[PDB]
């Protein structure tokens, strides 16, 4: 015959890759543009309880 | 088949052939002096062997 | 209840072609020393590497020496590895199916369409003989023999 | 019209021996799209340059079924080039004069004396199955498989 | 819960070893001590056919 | 049908005990927005990896309204991955053999001898209710909820 | 007889809660060899120093295979230290008095009011089971297991 290491034989070495595939984060809409401390902002932030 | 295994099969093949012929020659001597192949199961040659040449 | 040949164990070897499309043959034979009985599986030989049968030529002698013969051999490709001596290994009906040779003794060639449409496999597959029907009066010292025209490098 | 298998069009390569008188085989097969009809010429496979057939095994899968089947295959060597789509190429009854296989599923072997007397020609030639008589009912998807043994160095 | 990399999970890295254990060949009794020319060797070798 | 329910998925979390022998309980509940059928697999909750049930309390509302009720709930470990939705996964009867809780709303605690002998496993097995008898005439949006106490670090 | 379990010898381990109130449970089990007999004391396990039972669950196999079974297990706290092998050590009937479990497989829980009223002591008291009545007839490898829930910082 002739040697065949074949598929799935415990001799068949497998190499694991170190690089990670990441399901990247959904891009946020309400970024620093909209949120503001002034009156002219879609999302106002109230600093009346941040230190009190 | 030489990529799925880290071990190089050529050098192992050569070493196995060397050991194979070592065993074959000494067991040839032992059967010829004794006069029969008998029942030994580790002999290279099969049973019902009645001389090679 | 495997009766392993010298080919299956690894004592006698099997040729392999060095060129695609090159019929190579080696008559796989045993000398079974007991009368075959129903359910016996005989491992004649090994079908090496990426090869497929092309012509199968059974060469069984007279296995039934009684009255109305009943023995019906059939051959196939056994599942497990070539050398393992597990009794629980199945035998197919590809090359021959309920072949009636052995009732009288002689030669019967492949006559089933399954004998030529075998698929390849990267491992070594061993051709086995299963006696479908028990002999009426089994014969002891006769020999069965199968010849494979297996060719490598097919599609 | 000519129904070409993969071997004739050149998609699937055909084997040639690299030695004198070395038997070479290849499974010349085709899967029949639609149903066969009278006068159909199926260009199964290409016989290599200097080789001549030495044994041909024809296996088909119940082409017409039906009842009182009347189908009869007829294979031979076509005069045309390797793979030209010329509908004027003809098939002679060299290997199988009237296979009468395909009436029921089975395998037939070359029997006519003309099978082994084919002369060599320096160019490639295409082995072609011609359905001599129309089939009753018929079937679609049934495959025609020809197994051809040729030696490449005969005198 | 807790991240468990179970026994059968595909990420369970294995490491194949370079060193390959080998069966020791059977020692041969009939070494050069016995196989020799001349009369006084248990298994003498005929040298007539070696060169001719 | 395999009914996924919050805890089996990654939506709601089941807590690991921490320390050894610390009895830990979470309430695995389902709002069955459908009527249980003759054969269902209701993947209530996740028995966290390497932890054994110590006490199991089955809290269930009325599932059957017709006379002479025959609903039986079988609570057992169902083997496979944590939350892969396939119909191949099948549970057994470990925490409960065949419960009468289905006839009318009530609570019956673990009383099987084999309930407290569940063995460890390095992965997150899941606990599944199989309705092993006919729902009969009844059922609507209801709740089945087992409260099993599992401890880690057992021997 | 003083058939002591692995926990008594210290071979296995008994858990201690880190904080006051954490209900802790360990499965005190022995695969007792021989047969149960009248008057033998099985030292299943040891509750830690500052600890009182919070719920006791006793599950057993069939400790007698006969007609009119009459085995009655009694479990309670023992007197001497954990490891000292002295037949002059007595149990009580605190956790279970005439538990009458063992004629069937069964699972029993604490029923007597004295089960939950146990007083704490600084040293490792040992929980032992005494077979009060006769073992009826025959039991070889059946196992007895008791599961305790205990808190450490009671008042």
PDB file of N, CA and C in Angstrom, chain C residues 25 33 40 43 46 55 59 68-69 73 76 91-92 100 107-108 121 129 133 137 144 153:
ATOM      1  N   UNK C  25      -4.048  -5.651 -10.170  1.00  0.00           N
ATOM      2  CA  UNK C  25      -4.800  -6.751  -9.597  1.00  0.00           C
ATOM      3  C   UNK C  25      -3.907  -7.573  -8.688  1.00  0.00           C
ATOM      4  N   UNK C  33     -10.164 -22.901   7.480  1.00  0.00           N
ATOM      5  CA  UNK C  33     -10.028 -24.275   7.938  1.00  0.00           C
ATOM      6  C   UNK C  33     -11.277 -24.803   8.627  1.00  0.00           C
ATOM      7  N   UNK C  40     -20.958 -15.633   9.349  1.00  0.00           N
ATOM      8  CA  UNK C  40     -19.513 -15.463   9.293  1.00  0.00           C
ATOM      9  C   UNK C  40     -19.146 -14.365   8.305  1.00  0.00           C
ATOM     10  N   UNK C  43     -12.691 -11.487   5.811  1.00  0.00           N
ATOM     11  CA  UNK C  43     -12.001 -10.289   5.333  1.00  0.00           C
ATOM     12  C   UNK C  43     -10.919 -10.712   4.349  1.00  0.00           C
ATOM     13  N   UNK C  46      -7.737  -5.910   1.196  1.00  0.00           N
ATOM     14  CA  UNK C  46      -7.848  -4.480   1.441  1.00  0.00           C
ATOM     15  C   UNK C  46      -7.836  -3.753   0.104  1.00  0.00           C
ATOM     16  N   UNK C  55     -13.482  -4.587 -11.953  1.00  0.00           N
ATOM     17  CA  UNK C  55     -13.986  -5.917 -12.256  1.00  0.00           C
ATOM     18  C   UNK C  55     -13.639  -6.843 -11.103  1.00  0.00           C
ATOM     19  N   UNK C  59     -13.613 -16.530  -7.007  1.00  0.00           N
ATOM     20  CA  UNK C  59     -12.973 -17.804  -7.327  1.00  0.00           C
ATOM     21  C   UNK C  59     -13.184 -18.816  -6.210  1.00  0.00           C
ATOM     22  N   UNK C  68     -29.119 -30.472  -1.627  1.00  0.00           N
ATOM     23  CA  UNK C  68     -29.483 -29.224  -2.284  1.00  0.00           C
ATOM     24  C   UNK C  68     -28.668 -28.086  -1.684  1.00  0.00           C
ATOM     25  N   UNK C  69     -27.712 -27.532  -2.424  1.00  0.00           N
ATOM     26  CA  UNK C  69     -26.847 -26.496  -1.850  1.00  0.00           C
ATOM     27  C   UNK C  69     -27.639 -25.246  -1.509  1.00  0.00           C
ATOM     28  N   UNK C  73     -22.908 -16.557  -1.007  1.00  0.00           N
ATOM     29  CA  UNK C  73     -21.948 -15.535  -0.626  1.00  0.00           C
ATOM     30  C   UNK C  73     -22.396 -14.166  -1.121  1.00  0.00           C
ATOM     31  N   UNK C  76     -18.580  -7.040  -0.066  1.00  0.00           N
ATOM     32  CA  UNK C  76     -18.820  -5.620   0.101  1.00  0.00           C
ATOM     33  C   UNK C  76     -17.599  -4.955   0.687  1.00  0.00           C
ATOM     34  N   UNK C  91     -20.719  -5.615   6.751  1.00  0.00           N
ATOM     35  CA  UNK C  91     -20.307  -5.909   5.385  1.00  0.00           C
ATOM     36  C   UNK C  91     -21.419  -5.517   4.425  1.00  0.00           C
ATOM     37  N   UNK C  92     -21.065  -4.769   3.385  1.00  0.00           N
ATOM     38  CA  UNK C  92     -22.018  -4.358   2.379  1.00  0.00           C
ATOM     39  C   UNK C  92     -22.242  -5.430   1.328  1.00  0.00           C
ATOM     40  N   UNK C 100     -24.414 -16.804  -6.040  1.00  0.00           N
ATOM     41  CA  UNK C 100     -24.702 -18.222  -5.912  1.00  0.00           C
ATOM     42  C   UNK C 100     -23.507 -19.108  -6.226  1.00  0.00           C
ATOM     43  N   UNK C 107     -16.255 -19.854 -11.139  1.00  0.00           N
ATOM     44  CA  UNK C 107     -15.902 -18.446 -11.256  1.00  0.00           C
ATOM     45  C   UNK C 107     -17.140 -17.675 -11.684  1.00  0.00           C
ATOM     46  N   UNK C 108     -17.432 -16.588 -10.978  1.00  0.00           N
ATOM     47  CA  UNK C 108     -18.516 -15.684 -11.335  1.00  0.00           C
ATOM     48  C   UNK C 108     -17.988 -14.262 -11.274  1.00  0.00           C
ATOM     49  N   UNK C 121     -12.261   6.678  -1.062  1.00  0.00           N
ATOM     50  CA  UNK C 121     -12.077   7.072   0.326  1.00  0.00           C
ATOM     51  C   UNK C 121     -10.587   7.189   0.602  1.00  0.00           C
ATOM     52  N   UNK C 129     -16.230 -10.751   2.989  1.00  0.00           N
ATOM     53  CA  UNK C 129     -17.164 -11.745   2.476  1.00  0.00           C
ATOM     54  C   UNK C 129     -18.113 -12.141   3.593  1.00  0.00           C
ATOM     55  N   UNK C 133     -26.488 -17.198   3.612  1.00  0.00           N
ATOM     56  CA  UNK C 133     -27.229 -18.402   3.960  1.00  0.00           C
ATOM     57  C   UNK C 133     -26.253 -19.494   4.365  1.00  0.00           C
ATOM     58  N   UNK C 137     -24.254 -28.599   4.277  1.00  0.00           N
ATOM     59  CA  UNK C 137     -23.131 -29.348   4.845  1.00  0.00           C
ATOM     60  C   UNK C 137     -21.860 -28.631   4.399  1.00  0.00           C
ATOM     61  N   UNK C 144     -11.593 -19.767  -0.717  1.00  0.00           N
ATOM     62  CA  UNK C 144     -12.297 -18.754  -1.489  1.00  0.00           C
ATOM     63  C   UNK C 144     -11.274 -17.705  -1.891  1.00  0.00           C
ATOM     64  N   UNK C 153      -6.651   7.127  -8.903  1.00  0.00           N
ATOM     65  CA  UNK C 153      -6.696   8.376  -9.643  1.00  0.00           C
ATOM     66  C   UNK C 153      -7.894   8.533 -10.547  1.00  0.00           C
TER      67      UNK C 153
END
